[PDB]
Motif scaffolding. Structure first.
Motif, PDB file in Angstrom:
ATOM      1  N   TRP A  98      -5.955   7.420  37.012  1.00 49.25           N
ATOM      2  CA  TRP A  98      -5.332   6.314  36.340  1.00 49.25           C
ATOM      3  C   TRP A  98      -5.977   5.056  36.521  1.00 49.25           C
ATOM      4  N   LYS A  99      -6.741   4.810  37.210  1.00 53.20           N
ATOM      5  CA  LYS A  99      -7.707   3.411  36.957  1.00 53.20           C
ATOM      6  C   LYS A  99      -8.620   3.651  36.028  1.00 53.20           C
ATOM      7  N   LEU A 100      -9.189   5.069  35.901  1.00 54.63           N
ATOM      8  CA  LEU A 100      -9.785   5.094  34.481  1.00 54.63           C
ATOM      9  C   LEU A 100      -9.380   4.986  33.027  1.00 54.63           C
ATOM     10  N   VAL A 101      -8.073   5.510  33.355  1.00 60.15           N
ATOM     11  CA  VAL A 101      -7.236   5.660  32.022  1.00 60.15           C
ATOM     12  C   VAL A 101      -6.706   4.005  31.717  1.00 60.15           C
ATOM     13  N   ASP A 102      -6.425   3.313  32.599  1.00 60.29           N
ATOM     14  CA  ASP A 102      -5.960   1.854  32.444  1.00 60.29           C
ATOM     15  C   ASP A 102      -7.345   1.157  32.026  1.00 60.29           C
ATOM     16  N   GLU A 103      -8.458   1.256  32.303  1.00 54.17           N
ATOM     17  CA  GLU A 103      -9.669   0.887  31.921  1.00 54.17           C
ATOM     18  C   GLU A 103     -10.066   1.308  30.766  1.00 54.17           C
TER      19      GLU A 103
END
Length: 133
Positions: A98-103
């Motif tokens: 989710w951090k990757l997707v958010d970024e």
DNA sequence: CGCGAATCGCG
DNA sequence: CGCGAATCGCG
């Protein structure tokens, strides 16, 4: 008709949700231009969304006018909307994906790009180049 | 096997 | 006309 000087992006899934990876290959050579090592938990659609945005970043960096092919209606739609509409729960185990997707969303919202994102038509053209796995 | 996009009844 | 529940490609 197919554009052969293009980037083809694909995701690989060990169960879904589960371990996900992706890569970008030259559509012609099959040559691997970038690869994401396995992320312990994600979904097919998350991983393919990341794959397309990494492909956009890779090509922008390099001044390329090559288009990207993906065989995912969902991931293409999410990149166009700048929003990954995943059902994947947000907890400890899924915090990296989710951090990757958010970024990747933040990147799409703060950048312009000219790369066309095109649907790979598997039923007419066979499997996306180097389909995992 | 699950993930998400893209026919139905209803008023 | 739109609202939400309940076939497809893909790995």
């Amino acid at each position: 008709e197919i554009i052969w000087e293009s980037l083809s992006v694909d995701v690989g899934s060990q169960g879904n949700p589960g371990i996900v990876e992706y890569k970008g290959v030259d559509t012609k050579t099959g040559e691997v231009l970038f690869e994401r090592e396995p992320i312990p938990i994600g979904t097919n659609n998350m991983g393919e969304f990341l794959a397309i945005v990494h492909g956009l970043r890779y090509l922008k960096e390099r001044n390329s006018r090559k288009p990207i092919y993906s065989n995912s209606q969902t991931a293409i739609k999410w990149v166009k909307d700048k929003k990954a509409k995943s059902t994947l729960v947000r907890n400890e185990e899924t915090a990296l994906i989710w951090k990757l997707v958010d970024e990747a969303e933040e990147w799409l919202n703060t950048h312009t790009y000219e790369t066309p994102i095109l649907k790979w038509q598997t039923d007419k053209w066979g499997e996306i180049k180097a389909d995992y796995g």
